[PDB]
Amino acid sequence: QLLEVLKTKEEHQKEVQYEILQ
Amino acid sequence: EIKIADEVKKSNKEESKQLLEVLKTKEEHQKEVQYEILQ
Amino acid sequence: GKYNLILSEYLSFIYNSQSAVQIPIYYSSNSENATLLSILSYSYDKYNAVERKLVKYAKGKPLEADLTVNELDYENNKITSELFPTAEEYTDLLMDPAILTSLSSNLNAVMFWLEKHENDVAEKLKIYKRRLDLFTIVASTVNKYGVPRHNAKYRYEYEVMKDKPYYLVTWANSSIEMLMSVFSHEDYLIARELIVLSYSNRSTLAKLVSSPMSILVALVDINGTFITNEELELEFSNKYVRAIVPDQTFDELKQMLDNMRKAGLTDIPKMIQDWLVDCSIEKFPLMAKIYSWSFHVGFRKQKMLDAALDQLKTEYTEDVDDEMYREYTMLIRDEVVKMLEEPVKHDDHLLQDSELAGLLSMSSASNGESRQLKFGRKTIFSTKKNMHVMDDMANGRYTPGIIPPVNVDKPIPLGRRDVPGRRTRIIFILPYEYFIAQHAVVEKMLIYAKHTREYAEFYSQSNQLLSYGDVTRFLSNNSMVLYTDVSQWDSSQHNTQPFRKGIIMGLDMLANMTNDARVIQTLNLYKQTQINLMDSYVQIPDGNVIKKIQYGAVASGEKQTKAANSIANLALIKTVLSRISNKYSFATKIIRVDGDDNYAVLQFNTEVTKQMVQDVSNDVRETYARMNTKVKALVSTVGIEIAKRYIAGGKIFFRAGINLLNNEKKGQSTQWDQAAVLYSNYIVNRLRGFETDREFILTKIMQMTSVAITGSLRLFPSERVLTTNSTFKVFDSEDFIIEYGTTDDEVYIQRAFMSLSSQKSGIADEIAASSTFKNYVSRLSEQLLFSKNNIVSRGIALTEKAKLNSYAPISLEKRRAQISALLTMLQKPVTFKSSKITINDILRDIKPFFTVNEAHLPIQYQKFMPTLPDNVQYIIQCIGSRTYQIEDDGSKSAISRLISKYSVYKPSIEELYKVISLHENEIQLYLISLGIPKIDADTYVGSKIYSQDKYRILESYVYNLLSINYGCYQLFDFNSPDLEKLIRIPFKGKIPAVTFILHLYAKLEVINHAIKNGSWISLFCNYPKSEMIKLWKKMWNITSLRSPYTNANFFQD
Amino acid sequence: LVSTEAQIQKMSQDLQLEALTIQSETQFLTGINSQAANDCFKTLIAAMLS
RNA sequence: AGCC
């Protein structure tokens, strides 16, 4: 289990906080 | 979804495809500001 | 598809029986216009396949070996029973081809070619009549003694080589390599003398033919040259420099042509004889053809005592002048103070822990001694040095301070490294504590050499016109170049005492310049490796006895031998040019040293005549001989021999001697990996003037990539398995073009090779659970940081897992599991479904928006490399050679200037790319695992300079993916003003990541279209704004396909 | 005539159109080619003569 | 079954 696998991408942490534009 | 009108979403034009992509990278920026405050 | 047509025609030849059937396996991208995966073959009658078809080509008389042309008694081609009387004393290591392909495979690859081209038209008929007259000699000699059947691991036992001559296998291998490169009548007259004479003369044939090439590059006039600026950038200058040659060179070139007539060569000394009447550059590729063909004779494998006898037996005298050795020792002392003045005064972090600096980088050292180790319950024998540390750190024996003596009690073992047509060189096998002491100090010597004009690490790039282009920038009619060939550099008298005492004296003026207690210690241990090597004994085994010979000189295989041999040249050629200035008055323009081959350009007052060339050359080999360093002094006015490159008359000529069907050491690869080394040694020899047939090479990839599971079944993979951009790539469709395929079934198979790209090995998972591996990881985390963190320790313990991939059995359990897992996919045509972004997924979205039109470009630039093929010379003359080299090392960025300073690790550009696109607190978790402190990694993240560093890593990562700096794309200028008239892409701002890849992919499709067809096209890409934003989010999640055998395909030497 | 690709590239730098915002200076490039240039020249002469 |  390398360290480059465990740290989550920017697109993953942008999905735990939801909002609608309009 | 985007909740814009349904004749803009299913349309295949150039001036209406860019409008869906610009409103898609405003949500990813508004969720990027709200996530940085919570940390 | 052409390889699929030769694959189906090959199996209808080697299986002549009626019981052989071929079942092609197809597949498609859809569920229900299909490309084929492999070809099955069931054949049962397989005994005596090659020995039956050889008899129809065995005509004429066989070759009778001459037995009185070699000085030794075991270099003649005698019968092995006459040489080795009993089976207990039979050494295979004197004729071993060391390639995993036997002689009975190489004879079918020629007899298959001779059947396809048996009735051709009157132009290709003369090639067939020239390759048949040579194969009559090869077949009638093998058929007299029969064909030796190989072993299961492709060696040759005693009972199959008993009644045959000893070098029958390693002569029939190199002669097949030569007759499959005959294209012209000039190539047929050279191949007939190097096949007949090579059956008896196994000692001095590659030396006599390759001898006059150092002389013939000094007779060709210069009319227009490439030069280089002071910073390494190309310029074209069209001066006219006349070649001046004394009357003693032609009295020496006549002696070299009468030594080639005693050996029996009577038609190679007729081409040099008929070229010397003109001395022209337009017939000079004939003279480099003979120099390139001479290296294909074969290797000179000898006994270790018999090849290290003229090297280790020298005459040291005290009748030198001691007034010349005081300036030589002082000029070595002045360099070591000049190199380590700035990293000692300002105390650098790399010198402060030299014990840790050698420990984390011991995968770059040479292989040590073979020693028995114990890892838990297992007992393994290994020669890698970082496995010796894990066994010595457990048993309470790891003492890096105490440096072991190498005197008569514990001598130095000796290893060899040889090249055909030259003498052999010896390699020390030192203990593992001579690498720890000499690593952090030598690495500070090689950063000064990358900024100094007189060393060889300055002119070290990927191109070859920018590196060796400073030879001809000072050339005129009043100057001369002075390249000297020191014969035995390793054991001369100027290297034993005054070279080791010039370094020791330079480390005592650096123990008074500092104030730390650590920098005095790492400068004392590097001093301790020089006093112990002052009186070193060497160990050479022969027969029963083991000889211990005193050897106080300098050999290779050390760590400092690349950066301290370059100091001893710049101090020795500075002393000789000061003794020659008592007879003449000049001004030394440049001196440039690369190991032990150098040159120096002297500029005179009056014009250079024929008397100032004969009398300077008699004052170089008489001033060197006063210092007991005998040399062959050569002076020239137009051209030199810089290291393995021949700059003759404004053009640059390389050597093309790479042995395809032989090897010098038994490699630790499989057959699948040695079928890509065999192809990549064909592209290198094709670019340098030795053109082997492609259809002989593609036949050799057929016989090496196939793998059987049963004695009756065979599996032959197709073109789309070997050519696709994956881990399993072997060759390309067109030769010098790296193509990225865009088809719905071609991306379907490249994703199908992504599952089994990573396999596990049963040896490395048992070592990593043992007690002595956890003891080695625990004592590295103590020295790397004073604290203890759980994040860094798993970050260390999974970093030495990849270091065990340098071990040879561990790197074979992976690759044997790659091919054994591929066989379950080539038989079952259905594959799996997954999504992962590759470079081909990005090019799927760009290619349907390009529109092509026809265009033309007139020739404007000229050619500086005249041995390149014809379709590559049309590109260079139309868009131009490369002017300046763009770097892809990434050290101009601000994160690779922080990692290199504050830590000793070096991360790959595929590792810095993945971590630069994450959040702020994900770069923090990675930078602490490198050894950077918390206060420094909080500075770089909190400064927000990583946002401007995203585009300096992606620029150097895409240049690594598309292989622009390497391959054959390192000759064409990409910023040329003649490629911008063909690329017409309108500019759309604010997205630099997509606009960069639109111009780097359009520059490659125009070049790859003009190599395939020879005509230029112009592109136009009105890319929409709605497709740029969709491609913007896929530019950071791109993944590369890295293979260990492909990293050697980027460099040529 | 002037080339279509060599004039659109010249026109797309005087406008300085950005690939992120949505603007009315990206519709200046629609339907400009070498066949419609040859069509307006014909239907302006041939309309006046008939 | 391991640097033959």
Give the number of DSSP strands of chain C. Answer: 21
The main pleated sheet of chain A reads as: none
The count of domains of chain C is 8
* β-strand amount of chain A: under 5%
Q: What is the CATH fold-level name of the largest domain in chain C?
A: Tetracycline Repressor, domain 2
Strand line-up of the largest beta sheet of chain C: 8-7-10-11
What would you note in describing this structure?
- Chain A: Belongs to the rotavirus VP2 family.
- Chain A: It comes from Rotavirus A.
- Chain A: It is found in: Virion.
- The structure is cut from a larger assembly and holds three copies of chain A and one copy of chain C (1053 residues).
- Chain A has helices at 3-6, 10-13.
- Chain A is mainly α.
- Chain C has eight domains: 1-48 and 663-731 and 1040-1048, no CATH class; 49-201, Four Helix Bundle (Hemerythrin (Met), subunit A); 202-219 and 245-302, Viral RNA-directed RNA polymerase, 4-helical domain (Arc Repressor Mutant, subunit A, Orthogonal Bundle); 220-244 and 456-485 and 561-662, Alpha-Beta Plaits; 303-362 and 404-455 and 486-560, Tetracycline Repressor, domain 2, CATH 1.10.357.80; 363-403 and 732-833, no CATH class; 834-886 and 973-1039, 2-Layer Sandwich (Ribosomal Protein S5, domain 2), CATH 3.30.230.140; 887-972, Four Helix Bundle (Hemerythrin (Met), subunit A), CATH 1.20.120.
- Chain C has 43 helices and 21 strands.
- In chain C, β15 and β16 (645-648) form a beta hairpin.
- Chain C starts with a helix and ends in a 21-residue tail after the last helix.
- Classes of the chains: A mainly alpha (22), C alpha+beta (1053).
- Chains in contact: A-B, A-C, B-C, B-D, C-D.
- Chains C and D meet through α43 of C and α1 of D.
- Chain C binds one RNA strand of 4 nucleotides through residues 153, 155, 367, 370, 380-384, 666, 668, 763, 807-809, 812.
